[PDB]
Amino acid sequence: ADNLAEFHVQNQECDSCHTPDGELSNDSLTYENTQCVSCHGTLAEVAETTKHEHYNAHASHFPGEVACTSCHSAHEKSMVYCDSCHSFDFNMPYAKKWLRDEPTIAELAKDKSERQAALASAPHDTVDVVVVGSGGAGFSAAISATDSGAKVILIEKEPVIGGNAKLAAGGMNAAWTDQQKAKKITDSPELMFEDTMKGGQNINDPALVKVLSSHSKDSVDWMTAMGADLTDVGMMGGASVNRAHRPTGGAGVGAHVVQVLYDNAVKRNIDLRMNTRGIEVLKDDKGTVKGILVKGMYKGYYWVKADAVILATGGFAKNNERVAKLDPSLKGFISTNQPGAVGDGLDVAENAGGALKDMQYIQAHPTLSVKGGVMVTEAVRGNGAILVNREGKRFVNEITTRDKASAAILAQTGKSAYLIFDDSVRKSLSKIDKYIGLGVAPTADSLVKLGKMEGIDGKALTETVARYNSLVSSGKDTDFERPNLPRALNEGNYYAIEVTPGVHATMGGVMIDTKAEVMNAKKQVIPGLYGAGEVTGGVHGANRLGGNAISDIITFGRLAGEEAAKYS
Numbered sequence: 001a002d003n004l005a006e007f008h009v010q011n012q013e014c015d016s017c018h019t020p021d022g023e024l025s026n027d028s029l030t031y032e033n034t035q036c037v038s039c040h041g042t043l044a045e046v047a048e049t050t051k052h053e054h055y056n057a058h059a060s061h062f063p064g065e066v067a068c069t070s071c072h073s074a075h076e077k078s079m080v081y082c083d084s085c086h087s088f089d090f091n092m093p094y095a096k097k098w099l100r101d102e103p104t105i106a107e108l109a110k111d112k113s114e115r116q117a118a119l120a121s122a123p124h125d126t127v128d129v130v131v132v133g134s135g136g137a138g139f140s141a142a143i144s145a146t147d148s149g150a151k152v153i154l155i156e157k158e159p160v161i162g163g164n165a166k167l168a169a170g171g172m173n174a175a176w177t178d179q180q181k182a183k184k185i186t187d188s189p190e191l192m193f194e195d196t197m198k199g200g201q202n203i204n205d206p207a208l209v210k211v212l213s214s215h216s217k218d219s220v221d222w223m224t225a226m227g228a229d230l231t232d233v234g235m236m237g238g239a240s241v242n243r244a245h246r247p248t249g250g251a252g253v254g255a256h257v258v259q260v261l262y263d264n265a266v267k268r269n270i271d272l273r274m275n276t277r278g279i280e281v282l283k284d285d286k287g288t289v290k291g292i293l294v295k296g297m298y299k300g301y302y303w304v305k306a307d308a309v310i311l312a313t314g315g316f317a318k319n320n321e322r323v324a325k326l327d328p329s330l331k332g333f334i335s336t337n338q339p340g341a342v343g344d345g346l347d348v349a350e351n352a353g354g355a356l357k358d359m360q361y362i363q364a365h366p367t368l369s370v371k372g373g374v375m376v377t378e379a380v381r382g383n384g385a386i387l388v389n390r391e392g393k394r395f396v397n398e399i400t401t402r403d404k405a406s407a408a409i410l411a412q413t414g415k416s417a418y419l420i421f422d423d424s425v426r427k428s429l430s431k432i433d434k435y436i437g438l439g440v441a442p443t444a445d446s447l448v449k450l451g452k453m454e455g456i457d458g459k460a461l462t463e464t465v466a467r468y469n470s471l472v473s474s475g476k477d478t479d480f481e482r483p484n485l486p487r488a489l490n491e492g493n494y495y496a497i498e499v500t501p502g503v504h505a506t507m508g509g510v511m512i513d514t515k516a517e518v519m520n521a522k523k524q525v526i527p528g529l530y531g532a533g534e535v536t537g538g539v540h541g542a543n544r545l546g547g548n549a550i551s552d553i554i555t556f557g558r559l560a561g562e563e564a565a566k567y568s
């Protein structure tokens with residue numbers, strides 16, 4: 001057969017997958033995926049039949065309920081979603097090579113005829129607020145507006161939920177929490193504010209950083225009340241004390257937080273629509289929001305009538321063409337992001353009158369795996385690992401800010417470096433076992449053997465770790481001034497991960513005030529329009545601190561939903 005439907009119709013009727021009249025149920029293909037499951041079982045049941053030692057197409061780190069049609073189309077060949085970041089040996093029936101080529105908002109102006117027909121029709125739905133984006137900020141806004149009495153519709157352009165938020169690892173920053181007190185840590189919102197402004201080179205808007213520090217504990221409390229585990233508290237770069245909260249044992253914070261938000265949305269019966277892209281914010285004759293035009297992949301264009309729209313579409317770090325026009329030093333670099341993080345949300349905000357700010361400030365994460373092409377958490381360094389070059393020496397304070405750490409690594413021989421750690425560091429952070437499972441953390445029982453395996457001077461490496469452990473014992477790094485030295489690298493076996501910088505976060509975006517309202521270039525509010533999360537600018541200034549984006553998306557998403565519900 002040439003496609004999956006052709007295979008099935010040799011022995012089945014059309015109504016085995018379709019509704020009685022044949023129309024597609026909705027853009028999430030709810031009815032159709034329910035029929036796949038009726039014969040094959042749930043995704044976890046299918047996964048029992050497709051196990052590999054270290055990977056499985058049907059049992060991954062993605063949260064929520066991943067629809068079968070995310071990867072299996074019926075009437076045409078289709079792509080494996082995991083191929084956008086990995087290259088596992090798969091043999092999916094009727095597959096084609098991964099390729100993402102989404103039309104821009106400007107190119108969609110070519111659908112003049114279909115769009116005018118949709119806008120001439122009745123609105124498909126009439127609600128109070130529409131939220132665009134199913135990342136951490138969007139789910140937070142949808143839940144808080146619903147809890148404040150508003151009727152919401154939440155839309156997502158991709159086939160799966162979570163955006164970049166589901167990939168987060170290192171933690172969520174907050175001060176002075178009950179969780180910090182239980183681990184004997186002393187902190188304050190004032191200290192988090194001061195670290196944040198200094199880390200951003202004082203470019204941040206101080207009123208928005210005051211919202212970030214002062215609401216941080218309340219956001220950790222709100223997530224914990226909904227069922228999240230934020231009890232493990234570690235250190236990230238540029239922080240005075242440990243404040244990055246994540247699950248017990250050092251597991252990833254992102255997939256966990258997104259799964260909690262999704263379960264809480266399902267409990268409240270929130271209308272969530274996949275494969276549905278927001279295209280154009282609609283405004284009335286007085287300049288206030290009246291609704292939004294959307295494009296469903298399977299059902300086409302339609303509009304929703306509403307008093308408020310909350311844009312929560314994330315950043316644009318996957319789009320290297322746009323990144324290079326703003327910061328040419330990052331042209332041609334690989335990215336840590338999901339395939340849809342290209343900035344179309346910024347285009348929608350500008351078309352509605354919103355102004356942008358700080359667009360030139362873009363962050364490279366210092367440690368992407370050279371072998372796997374995926375981000376390696378900064379929590380590996382925070383829990384104790386060091387960085388060495390090909391000559392086997394340390395060369396930088398490993399917990400400095402990301403701008404300085406990326407530059408340092410690029411200055412070394414081969415433009416890459418190695419994370420080095422032992423079993424004491426491995427057992428303190430369970431996320432490290434995920435890098436061992438991916439095959440990007442080679443190990444040996446001596447540093448001479450490990451240096452030979454990877455191309456690092458072995459004698460120098462051995463001497464480097466001995467000296468570092470001596471610095472840890474005395475309490476002061478006289479070589480690179482690293483201010484926190486948590487563990488000596490001397491238990492069990494040794495591990496190396498080859499790393500280099502990659503494009504990771506865009507600190508600029510739509511201009512918002514402290515109530516999350518979007519403003520134009522004259523600094524006037526656009527009534528009914530809100531923004532929250534990485535789509536906004538002014539919170540992180542010239543360099544974001546690790547742990548501060550998960551904090552931002554919960555705080556500003558929650559505030560935007562409450563403000564939009566009150567606006568009504």
Ligand SMILES: Cc1cc2nc3c(=O)[nH]c(=O)nc-3n(C[C@H](O)[C@H](O)[C@@H](O)COP(=O)(O)OP(=O)(O)OC[C@H]3O[C@@H](n4cnc5c(N)ncnc54)[C@H](O)[C@@H]3O)c2cc1C
Nearest residue numbers: 133135137163164165168169170278314533534547549550
């Ligand atoms: C690998 C990785 C690890 C990270 N680790 C951490 C961590 O440990 N700590 C931390 O502080 N931050 C971390 N970050 C940053 C953090 O995950 C991001 O800032 C993300 O949390 C921002 O969330 P968001 O809700 O604004 O956007 P996202 O989570 O990116 O979600 C936005 C959603 O909007 C959808 N969308 C876009 N345009 C449209 C449209 N027109 N119509 C409909 N839907 C649309 C996108 O497809 C996406 O699903 C990490 C980022 C990455 C990529």
Ligand code: HEM
Nearest residue numbers: 007008012016017032033035036039040068069072074093
């Ligand atoms: C979009 C919906 C569905 C998806 C994604 C899906 C998935 C698949 C795939 C990937 C195959 C393997 C094809 C090949 O070997 O070339 C398959 C085969 C098969 N499917 Fe489906 N399926 C769907 C709907 C259904 C339904 C509704 C039924 C039953 C009424 C069904 C019953 C079967 C059977 C009997 C086989 C042959 C192998 C076996 O006996 O398990 N499928 N399906």
Ligand code: HEM
Nearest residue numbers: 004005008009013014017024032069072073074075076298
């Ligand atoms: C001869 C039998 C069938 C007929 C006549 C038929 C008809 C159609 C049509 C006309 C569409 C597009 C509708 C639109 O654009 O609005 C469609 C899409 C679709 N059909 Fe079928 N269908 C048949 C069998 C099946 C089978 C056996 C399956 C599943 C195994 C299936 C699953 C789907 C799905 C998931 C879609 C959405 C797009 C895609 O994945 O290709 N159909 N079908």
Ligand code: HEM
Nearest residue numbers: 040042043046050057066067068070071080081090091092
């Ligand atoms: C419940 C939802 C789904 C069903 C019922 C389904 C069905 C199937 C079936 C019947 C097979 C063939 C297994 C065999 O050889 O015995 C298969 C293979 C495969 N499917 Fe799915 N699928 C689902 C969701 C997905 C999703 C979401 C993805 C991608 C993330 C995916 C990607 C693949 C791949 C890559 C293979 C080949 C696996 C390998 O080579 O190890 N499927 N699927």
Ligand code: HEM
Nearest residue numbers: 054055056057060061082084085337338374375434437438
């Ligand atoms: C359904 C699709 C996918 C599958 C089956 C898959 C599979 C895996 C596997 C087997 C690992 C090693 C650790 C583990 O066993 O969980 C891993 C790690 C990782 N994957 Fe994926 N992956 C998928 C999609 C993606 C995509 C699209 C991205 C990036 C946007 C991504 C980003 C990462 C990262 C950053 C890691 C490092 C470890 C961690 O952060 O937990 N994955 N993945």
Ligand SMILES: O=C(O)/C=C/C(=O)O
Nearest residue numbers: 169170377378546547
């Ligand atoms: O886990 C990391 O390294 C990412 C943290 C962040 O981008 O804030």
Ligand code: NA
Nearest residue numbers: 507508509534
């Ligand atoms: Na931003």
